[PDB]
Amino acid sequence: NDDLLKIIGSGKHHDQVSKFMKKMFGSIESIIFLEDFITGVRSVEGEVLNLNEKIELKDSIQAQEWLNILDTEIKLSVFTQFRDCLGQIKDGTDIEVVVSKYIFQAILLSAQVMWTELVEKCLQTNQFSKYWKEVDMKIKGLLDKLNKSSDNVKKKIEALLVEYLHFNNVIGQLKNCSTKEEARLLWAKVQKFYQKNDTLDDLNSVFISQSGYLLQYKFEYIGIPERLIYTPLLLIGFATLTDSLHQKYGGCFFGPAGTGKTETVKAFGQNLGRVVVVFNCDDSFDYQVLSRLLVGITQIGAWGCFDEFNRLDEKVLSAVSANIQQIQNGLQVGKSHITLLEEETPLSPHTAVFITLNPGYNGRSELPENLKKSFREFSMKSPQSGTIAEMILQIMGFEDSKSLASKIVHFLELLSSKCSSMNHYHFGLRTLKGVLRNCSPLISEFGEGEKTVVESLKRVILPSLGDTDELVFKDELSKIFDSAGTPLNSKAIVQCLKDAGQRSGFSMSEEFLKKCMQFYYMQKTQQALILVGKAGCGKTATWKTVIDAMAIFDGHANVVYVIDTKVLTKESLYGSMLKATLEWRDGLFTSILRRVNDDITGTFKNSRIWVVFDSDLDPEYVEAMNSVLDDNKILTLPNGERLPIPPNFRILFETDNLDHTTPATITRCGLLWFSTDVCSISSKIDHLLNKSYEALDNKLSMFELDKLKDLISDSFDMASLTNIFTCSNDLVHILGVRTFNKLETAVQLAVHLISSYRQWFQNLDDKSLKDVITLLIKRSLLYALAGDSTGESQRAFIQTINTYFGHDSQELSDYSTIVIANDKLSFSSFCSEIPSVSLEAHEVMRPDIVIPTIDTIKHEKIFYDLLNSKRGIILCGPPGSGKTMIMNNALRNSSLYDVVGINFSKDTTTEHILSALHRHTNYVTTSKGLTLLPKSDIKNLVLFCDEINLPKLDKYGSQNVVLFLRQLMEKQGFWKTPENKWVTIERIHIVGACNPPTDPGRIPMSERFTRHAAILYLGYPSGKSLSQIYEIYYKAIFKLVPEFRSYTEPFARASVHLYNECKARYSTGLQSHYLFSPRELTRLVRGVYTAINTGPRQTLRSLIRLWAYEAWRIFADRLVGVKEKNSFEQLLYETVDKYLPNQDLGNISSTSLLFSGLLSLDFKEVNKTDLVNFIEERFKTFCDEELEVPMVIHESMVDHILRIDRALKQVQGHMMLIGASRTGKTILTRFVAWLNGLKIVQPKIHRHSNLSDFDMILKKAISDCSLKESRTCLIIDESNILETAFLERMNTLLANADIPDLFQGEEYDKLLNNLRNKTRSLGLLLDTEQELYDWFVGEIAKNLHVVFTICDPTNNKSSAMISSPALFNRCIINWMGDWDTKTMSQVANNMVDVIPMEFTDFTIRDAVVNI
Amino acid sequence: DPIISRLISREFNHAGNRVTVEIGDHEVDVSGDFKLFIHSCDPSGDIPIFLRSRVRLVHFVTNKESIETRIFDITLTEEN
Amino acid sequence: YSIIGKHSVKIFSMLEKFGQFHWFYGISIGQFLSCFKRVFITRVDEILWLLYQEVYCQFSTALDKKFKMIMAMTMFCLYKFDIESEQYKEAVLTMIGVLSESSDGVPKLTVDTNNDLRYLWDYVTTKSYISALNWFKNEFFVDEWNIADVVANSDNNYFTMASERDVDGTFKLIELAKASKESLKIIPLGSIENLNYAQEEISKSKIEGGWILLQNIQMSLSWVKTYLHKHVEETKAAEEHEKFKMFMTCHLTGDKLPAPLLQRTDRFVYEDIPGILDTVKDLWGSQFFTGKISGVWSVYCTFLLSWFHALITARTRLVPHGFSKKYYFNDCDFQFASVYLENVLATNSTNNIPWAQVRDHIATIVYGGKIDEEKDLEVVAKLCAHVFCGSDNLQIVPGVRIPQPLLQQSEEEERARLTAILSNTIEPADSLSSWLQLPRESILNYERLQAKEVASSTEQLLQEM
Ligand SMILES: Nc1ncnc2c1ncn2[C@@H]1O[C@H](COP(=O)(O)OP(=O)(O)OP(=O)(O)O)[C@@H](O)[C@H]1O
Ligand SMILES: Nc1ncnc2c1ncn2[C@@H]1O[C@H](COP(=O)(O)OP(=O)(O)O)[C@@H](O)[C@H]1O
Ligand SMILES: Nc1ncnc2c1ncn2[C@@H]1O[C@H](COP(=O)(O)OP(=O)(O)O)[C@@H](O)[C@H]1O
Ligand SMILES: [Mg+2]
């Protein structure tokens, strides 16, 4: 309708219609005028057709009328140009003459008719040889004419070459036949184009024979479309299509995509002078448009092909399928008018319908039942390769195309049979199409010979082979064809490569030069390159080295864009369009093209542009740019453009695996398989040392540097390290990284430790100097090979180091230290010296408190040494092992570094990282790195990313958040996600903590990221250091009860024994939440203090019960069932008897010891009867005031109320309740909250709740807690966590004390403003932006209380709650999972308290309850 | 949806004459003439644990076990 | 009755599970009860066995030959496991385990103890499979119902027979009507005219009382869910209407019918497979109804095709050993081949030698069109090699020799002569190996596999209850 209306409206003008013709014709693009007259038309291909009669145009003419004349004349014009040409060649005129003056369609048809007639007669005579050479000459004639041609007519010659090759091929096959019968079989199968010189109706004069059947050429213009190369298989498709059509049946071929079933339908139409309309089905395609199109086809008598029919929706597909039957049933019968879409429309018998059927998930799709008896199904197969090889060789400039095609196929076939079975190996025809395509530029250098074939083989086949198969290639290449001894461009490139590496730092190894050479030779031909290998192969070195070497050799500048593919979304990278305003915004990959295409203001024309994708590559991303990888060399927008890419513009891909990618994607690109690392262990260190020396040159004098480099050279030789690196493998490596990728970690540490003691190197003894060096080198070499080891392994590796280093050289000790005087020169090595800490009662629990041990100082030192190197640190180990504390305290002490904690969860986004950072970081446009992201204050920043092996990965399996950090560690900046440019981060450091990846929940991380990190395995300590540590903790808290100062050590020893036993008795083998750590101890130690600091003077009997209650709440509340719960009761008994032997104890079961501050002004042990009665007076009240709910108060409930009470009382109160269903876990929480004076917030979520809604519910409860000082209790149920994100928000609220995402940007400024109002109100000004938010956070931490109610932890959704580390660690876990038999009887009693019943046999009430 | 939830668990906020219940946000008056029933078709579809526990679960399904009961009636009409 | 009762659930549970596997294999509880009621019009022991017999006789008809046999083996284990000894149970399970490839061992031999069971082991040990599979049916001692018998017993006006694409019971139904109650009305569901005429002839025939058939409903299905779904549900007055019977034809392999509609209507699986020679005779048979339009020499080619088609279709059944997968060749494929044959005689000389491109076109376009596996494509070809090239005497099958048109050149003589060669031949015992060139060894391998399928599925079904 729309386009139709424009044509009728634009009639006055006429000229405006040309745009719409391209659609309603398919062949033509625009119409040519003299304005009064139509001189001709042009095809979409570029070809100009002139009409016989130029159609005159006037005011009193309809669009209808004039266009209808055009259609008639356009077909007549084709007959004219056909007979004109055919007659010419009959009168022996050379085809080179004809080309220049006749449209391709016409000359094509003429050739076919004359060819066919000349071969028809050749079958009688058998004069094949003489016609053959004659045609072979026309072939060469057309080939040399192509090289001297205008690009437009260059298409016409090439299109005709498709045909003339087919001509000679058929004659050749005919020459070869054993007999005349053999020749007449072959001929029947071919498409024979005949003419009637007997009858009139000339548009009906040309007809075609195949397989005994005829098909009248309809005259319609086709333009000059790229013609399908003739294969036997092609002819067979043509043969079935004619056999179907002859009986008035539809053609249908099913087969794999990329078999060109529609191409065939297209081609077979063209061969008979028809433009077949292709319906690409299901591509947002309306039924109403197709119902239109169908009527159009049945009237115009056109050919319709349904391109991948299968992909249509059941509703559509029924409707379409039914319609098609009408048409095919109408034709089969020949009914003049047929009814479809409930309308009587007439049917041309020229009409035909074709259905291509791509396979579904099951296998090959099917026709609906109705269509089965109306169509004829055929199986498209890829062509046997030999045949396509020969033709492709023939077009380019043959030499002997027959033998090259034999030889190429045999070789590729032989490779497959002889090489190893490797995943990325393809010796499929795609590969020979590629070897052949690569050949064209190659011919330009050498010849149309086998030798150019040979070079193409080794250009494509070799770079993708791995060393074993690399000789299989050489052996069978020389076996099949031996071409040339030496290569051109052998010296000149090589010196341009070596000079680039000498400057880069690199060593020219056999392999680095090889893989450098393989690359150089590929960029030439291939525009897209793939580099695959082990992480740290040298791939970024090889390409960065070759690229650099070409600016020396050609003189052409390079402009490199390294993009981590998978850090950004497809929208962020390719082009994202926004729902409502449909605003087209650039993205990342398209915006950097616009510099080259749209605005080459500087030199981009003489420059080389290279766009590298470092990250793991997947289908979804390559599919969005498949068009650039195609012969097209153009980028297709999701909406609104194709952007052309120049020959300058190369795409690289560096990656570690290919498992995800398609063989189709590979064979468009050039693959460079890195079989091994480019260069020697030594050679790596060599480069690395020098690179490290350079850092120092900007903070160290030449005299200092010259002397320090002299030291390094004579302290360590390669012969030593060789065995040390060998022995490194004979060791158990947690978070394993290969030996080679450990080297940067070694040398960087070694250089830093030596440059540390540089002043002491001026005066010190030359024997003694060597020993200082050797010790630091022995140390740095240890942590870089064995730092991620057990340390039980480290100790054993220390001796391994000592062994292989020179015998005289200073040996390494477990706690080895170097000692020097502060103000006066001294030397000597003495070890293991520890400060003594005194802290008071209140100091006992503090977010920043660490008791120095033999190991705390040992760890803090090494961790800090790595930062000075500025290497990323990965701390691996179990929970409570002190990764967080060791890291935090080493840095909260120093003025240099400033810490920011980011806590990672199962699904963390890369913007979460950025939002958290936005409070502590400041964008400034300094000319040094364009945009920079340094820290908001002048001194260094450290991002501590906790649980780095927790975030999940793409459906393919790639964690972007990890790759983002990898980007930061390797690249040093990153691409801005919305604004789309490069920001280089200044002085920001990455440190991460993680659990072993053998632990459940844990995700394995990419060696491409972990290669940049020094890895430190921290375990648990001693069971004897722990006892020492918490003694000092009891010492501190017993400053409140000095009368029991004697009792601090047996208390600390008891606490640790209970720990050791619980951890051993109740492990993750029994229950997943059975996870104990020194965190519990510190909870117990503090839990004891709190009862003391707010309790009556404590007797020895009090204190042990006070300790016992805390031990119960910290270790046993989480325990399930009764067998384990009773086990702990006896354990607690067993422990007191071994460490605190007294006769004053009572019943130590949790039921009998009840501690509360609800009755008492102090936290004191209260009476069972006193408590029950206090609850009963308060529950009435809570029943009346709040929600009206009847319950029975029973022994368990009182015990449970106190559990929640202690939880909701602590500053940071997190408790998760596991209560099955009906236990009342939700009611008791509401009650204890109401007793403590907490506002009960319970997210009113529902089926139709968004994340934003829950965001709201959180945000409010947060804002009321700081800006209104609310003291709210937030009850979150398993039902409340609707999506995964909801729970992720809950984590951020626990592991950190704020949700950074909620308050960002403007909402940050509004909060920032409101915050200053309340801060002033309370009576303090806070100076910096950081100082105000730190109060806001600290206020949340003490006013917000999150209580979780999950019913079945067996459920996979409720599993995720417990799983989440943030929730599990910062919560008090409690178990209400079942009702005890005693509590069942107790409840039942109070319910049968009303007595309808009368005395019975036997108690009566007691008996009923027992049943 | 979660919101009905207070209507399922018998929770209410008392007045002299009026009895109110919280749904989503709005507090609405409960009649006393009001009755509630929940209907489902497929035992394949799982109802949330909160509901399942406060709700009186009743199966109106003609089972395989239905055949056992119905065959004895048919046997005994033809036997005694 | 609990003892009776417990058996009937495991029975119904088994029949129920067939419906999970395949859509056409439904059973309702009322079907089971109506069946159990029939059983009436140590007494508890007899009534039990009367059930298992009656269940077999009624519900067997609506399953295909594979499921008939799985139901037999399973039902036999459901009965004899409860009734007979535990000595029995492991002996028969050990034998079902040899028939499946689960295990192979020799059962309990007790002279005179068990003879029926000793007789089964003889079948399994003789590697004779189909006989061992049937033993479970026979052991029920029931006279197994013909579609006819089903129809006579049934008093419903509706029927749906599904069938494999290999056959159509359209012609069974013709002889079923003609032998009693006449009134045969075939209604093709093709295009809008057919559906439109169809729904007219439906409403009129029920009042009239004539039989009606709705050929190949699956294809016209969108209409079924709209018109037939309402129409058959509404027509409880069809019970009130004159003795009339409507039939519907399905294909098991193919689009799924609505369960509610299917359950309303009685179900049969036409499993009835014709001989090679009989299909030759059925093919050649119709070709005389045309009159005379083609010359004498063509009649020969048409006879050749009749053999060829009857040989490929027979080979279709035997997979894997035969064709790689199940391929279906139609009357449409015969038509396109005959079309090309008339044409090659119309375009060529009466010299016999046009034969080379007759092979290619028949083996690569006409029949090889569907075929996708190269392995199978060579089979079609090697058969065209045999059927199509040949001088004077062909010997299509070992008995029969096909002689080329005689100098007399009579087309009426030749029809009579080529019909005579059919009437003289008797299709041998071992036809599937002797006539389809493939060896006997392969046939047995096929026999073994279908044994394996029934024995596996029964093991699985027993453990499941
Ligand atoms: N010729 C050479 N001599 C010495 N060292 C070399 C040589 N070539 C490469 N290297 C070392 O190998 C490293 C090359 O790193 P590169 O980024 O190329 O590897 P990669 O496989 O791309 O790693 P990733 O995949 O993680 O980015 C350099 O750090 C360098 O120390
Ligand atoms: N040597 C120590 N000095 C002080 N506290 C310690 C020590 N060892 C363990 N802890 C306690 O254990 C907890 C350490 O847990 P953390 O390091 O956060 O676990 P992880 O790092 O495994 O996540 C702290 O709360 C602290 O009280
Ligand atoms: N001590 C008790 N006395 C009486 N009823 C109880 C008791 N504990 C739980 N219930 C019943 O079980 C249900 C659970 O209430 P709730 O407090 O929400 O626990 P949950 O969160 O486990 O459902 C309530 O409807 C209540 O009737
Ligand atoms: Mg890199």
Side-chain angles (χ1 to χ4, degrees), chain C residues 92-253:
Chain C
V92 57
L93 288 166
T94 202
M95 279 185 302
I96 290 158
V98 181
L99 288 160
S100 183
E101 315 277 305
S102 332
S103 58
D104 58 316
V106 172
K108 295 275 181 186
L109 177 97
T110 29
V111 178
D112 280 284
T113 300
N114 290 334
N115 274 288
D116 53 348
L117 200 95
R118 211 146 64 103
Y119 173 66
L120 207 187
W121 202 69
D122 192 44
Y123 277 137
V124 190
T125 204
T126 41
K127 319 281 270 161
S128 59
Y129 294 103
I130 299 174
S131 50
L133 254 49
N134 281 303
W135 181 104
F136 300 84
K137 313 145 94 192
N138 277 300
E139 190 63 68
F140 272 87
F141 302 119
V142 168
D143 293 337
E144 286 139 339
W145 282 13
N146 262 271
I147 290 127
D149 288 350
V150 167
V151 175
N153 188 31
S154 294
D155 178 351
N156 189 53
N157 286 344
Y158 297 57
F159 304 100
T160 43
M161 65 165 172
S163 201
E164 290 287 337
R165 315 197 173 258
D166 312 293
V167 274
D168 63 297
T170 313
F171 302 86
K172 183 53 70 227
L173 228 58
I174 305 303
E175 66 136 49
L176 293 172
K178 198 216 130 219
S180 55
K181 278 294 254 151
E182 295 210 30
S183 294
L184 43 98
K185 319 262 195 147
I186 59 131
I187 307 294
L189 269 40
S191 277
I192 283 162
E193 173 66 16
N194 295 8
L195 268 58
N196 250 10
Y197 168 83
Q199 61 177 85
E200 282 166 31
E201 274 281 277
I202 282 161
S203 304
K204 278 277 198 87
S205 287
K206 57 186 81 192
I207 316 164
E208 293 163 277
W211 279 17
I212 197 93
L213 163 62
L214 302 171
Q215 299 212 263
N216 199 356
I217 214 144
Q218 287 192 313
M219 85 166 83
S220 59
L221 179 139
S222 70
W223 169 67
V224 180
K225 299 174 170 170
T226 56
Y227 176 99
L228 179 61
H229 189 275
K230 285 176 151 190
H231 199 94
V232 177
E233 187 210 283
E234 278 158 49
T235 37
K236 278 204 137 219
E239 191 166 16
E240 178 212 69
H241 301 342
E242 203 178 306
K243 262 276 160 148
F244 141 78
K245 286 170 188 193
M246 180 159 96
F247 300 87
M248 291 155 272
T249 323
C250 279
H251 275 112
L252 300 166
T253 59

Side-chain angles (χ1 to χ4, degrees), chain A residues 849-851 853 856 878-885 1029-1030 1078-1079 1082:
Chain A
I849 199 96
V850 73
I851 297 306
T853 315
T856 276
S881 91
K883 310 156 301 336
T884 59
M885 178 182 71
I1029 282 145
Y1030 291 98
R1079 188 165 285 108
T1082 297

Side-chain angles (χ1 to χ4, degrees), chain A residues 386-613:
Chain A
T387 66
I388 326 80
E390 184 177 1
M391 290 269 147
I392 295 170
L393 277 153
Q394 182 72 67
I395 297 231
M396 296 177 297
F398 58 117
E399 178 73 346
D400 296 2
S401 61
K402 195 211 195 214
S403 268
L404 301 194
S406 292
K407 279 180 265 157
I408 288 159
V409 170
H410 187 39
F411 176 61
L412 291 171
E413 187 189 40
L414 220 54
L415 282 162
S416 189
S417 188
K418 272 252 221 274
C419 295
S420 80
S421 55
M422 186 97 72
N423 264 20
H424 75 302
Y425 277 7
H426 303 313
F427 298 6
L429 180 145
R430 336 199 79 148
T431 285
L432 63 102
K433 273 199 262 157
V435 183
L436 290 174
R437 243 182 293 106
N438 170 48
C439 187
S440 175
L442 180 61
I443 297 166
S444 300
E445 200 133 71
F446 220 81
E448 288 96 346
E450 88 174 10
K451 282 146 121 278
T452 299
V453 156
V454 194
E455 289 301 302
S456 268
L457 281 177
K458 290 191 290 190
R459 298 187 185 291
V460 170
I461 299 315
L462 263 175
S464 290
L465 305 145
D467 318 296
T468 324
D469 303 316
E470 275 211 33
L471 76 77
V472 191
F473 186 99
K474 283 249 138 195
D475 284 345
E476 315 292 286
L477 186 89
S478 195
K479 178 188 197 162
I480 301 308
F481 47 103
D482 210 49
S483 83
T486 315
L488 310 161
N489 272 330
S490 66
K491 338 272 187 139
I493 309 296
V494 80
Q495 201 62 50
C496 287
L497 269 175
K498 300 177 163 294
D499 287 341
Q502 299 288 290
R503 187 153 45 91
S504 299
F506 308 165
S507 310
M508 307 296 140
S509 65
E510 301 229 323
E511 191 76 13
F512 186 61
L513 212 61
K514 178 160 110 167
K515 297 293 158 182
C516 265
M517 276 329 271
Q518 282 182 14
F519 185 91
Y520 167 66
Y521 284 161
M522 286 167 104
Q523 112 268 128
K524 273 195 183 154
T525 294
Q526 288 268 17
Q527 182 129 66
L529 272 309
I530 301 160
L531 308 96
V532 179
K534 319 204 101 231
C537 257
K539 3 157 174 123
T540 319
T542 298
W543 68 258
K544 264 168 182 175
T545 289
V546 184
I547 293 158
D548 175 9
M550 285 158 63
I552 290 149
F553 174 89
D554 290 84
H556 288 50
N558 319 101
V559 175
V560 180
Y561 302 89
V562 185
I563 294 99
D564 282 353
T565 309
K566 234 195 165 73
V567 170
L568 294 175
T569 51
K570 283 142 274 204
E571 296 87 87
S572 301
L573 179 67
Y574 295 122
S576 192
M577 188 160 80
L578 322 156
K579 276 209 163 176
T581 33
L582 322 160
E583 282 254 30
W584 208 82
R585 299 206 91 211
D586 291 351
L588 180 64
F589 180 51
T590 52
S591 57
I592 50 168
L593 193 51
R594 261 171 178 94
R595 310 175 200 207
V596 202
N597 284 337
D598 187 70
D599 292 341
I600 34 167
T601 316
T603 62
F604 292 74
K605 219 162 175 193
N606 203 261
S607 84
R608 299 172 203 245
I609 295 99
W610 316 73
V611 174
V612 194
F613 299 56

Side-chain angles (χ1 to χ4, degrees), chain A residues 181 184-186 188-189 211-213 236 239-240 243-247 249 254 314 318 322 325-326 329 339-342 364 366 368-370 372-373 376-379 381 384, chain C residues 165 189-192 216 218-219 222 225 251 253-255 330-333 335-336 339-341 343 347 353 356-357 360-361 364-374 377:
Chain A
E181 309 166 287
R184 286 187 274 96
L185 175 63
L186 198 146
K189 303 194 228 144
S211 284
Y213 302 136
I236 299 146
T240 59
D243 180 79
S244 302
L245 284 180
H246 174 84
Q247 274 261 249
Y249 266 72
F254 61 86
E314 266 275 87
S318 177
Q325 175 160 9
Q326 295 311 110
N329 214 274
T339 192
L340 67 90
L341 171 82
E342 303 140 343
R364 288 138 195 272
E366 282 173 10
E369 299 290 317
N370 67 39
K372 304 182 95 54
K373 287 285 161 185
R376 289 217 92 211
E377 303 199 32
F378 189 72
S379 66
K381 329 191 124 211
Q384 288 209 9
Chain C
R165 315 197 173 258
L189 269 40
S191 277
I192 283 162
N216 199 356
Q218 287 192 313
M219 85 166 83
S222 70
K225 299 174 170 170
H251 275 112
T253 59
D255 303 340
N330 301 315
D331 300 64
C332 294
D333 304 41
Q335 179 209 286
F336 271 67
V339 146
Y340 169 85
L341 291 158
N343 183 83
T347 195
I353 221 90
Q357 51 185 84
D360 278 10
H361 184 83
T364 75
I365 278 102
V366 167
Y367 285 98
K370 328 182 145 192
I371 286 113
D372 63 271
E373 294 298 321
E374 208 57 79
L377 258 162

